[PDB]
Amino acid sequence: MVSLTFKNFKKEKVPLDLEPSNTILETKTKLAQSISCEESQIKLIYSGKVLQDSKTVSECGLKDGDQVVFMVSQKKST
């Protein structure tokens, strides 16, 4: 029951709950279903280190109640 905070570029925090298993795929999906923006443009970063959809949370290096860096794009992406 880890709750992290995803910040964009306007210095806004978007709290999110995940698990050691849950992966970026889901964090990306939610973070997108929270702001209403597709995760196909989003860039889930970690301390200035663009994460990867192939990495979970445990691999991401996140912990319980931390902070994650991310950003949204404008390209709808096919």
Partner: protein, 131 residues
């Protein structure tokens, strides 16, 4: 011997100054990075905006402009371009604007293809802090 292109952006340039509403940007900004329009008219339009919002300020504008810095292939024009582009990404913040902190954070973060030079540039010169 004036070009029709310049004559265009010119007219509009005086239009915005006639209405600083949230509509102009609601249409311009987006177009600045919609599908995949030539980085030509897109860039020129980037200067027209900054010139107007020269006084105002916003982060969103840096959001779209950022994505561009990435896809930036520079495969087109390879002679005198970093200067102008650099200016905006720079002057955009004369002082008092943490936004600059969030920027350098993303730029550098997102790998390091060809933005280091600009990273050190805006890095050093930033918060003028005019006492």
């Amino acid at each position: 011997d004036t070009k029709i292109s310049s004559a265009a952006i010119l007219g509009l340039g005086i239009a915005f100054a006639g209405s600083k509403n949230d509509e102009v940007l609601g249409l311009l900004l987006p177009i600045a990075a919609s599908t995949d329009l030539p980085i030509e008219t897109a860039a020129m339009a980037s200067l027209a905006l900054a010139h107007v919002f020269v006084g105002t300020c916003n982060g969103d504008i840096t959001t779209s402009i950022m994505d561009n810095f990435l896809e930036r292939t520079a495969i087109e024009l390879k002679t005198d371009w970093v200067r102008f582009l650099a200016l905006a990404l720079g002057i955009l913040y004369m002082g008092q604007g943490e936004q600059v902190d969030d920027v350098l954070e993303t730029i550098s973060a997102i790998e390091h293809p060809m933005t280091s030079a600009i990273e050190v540039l805006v890095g050093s010169c930033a918060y003028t802090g005019t006492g």
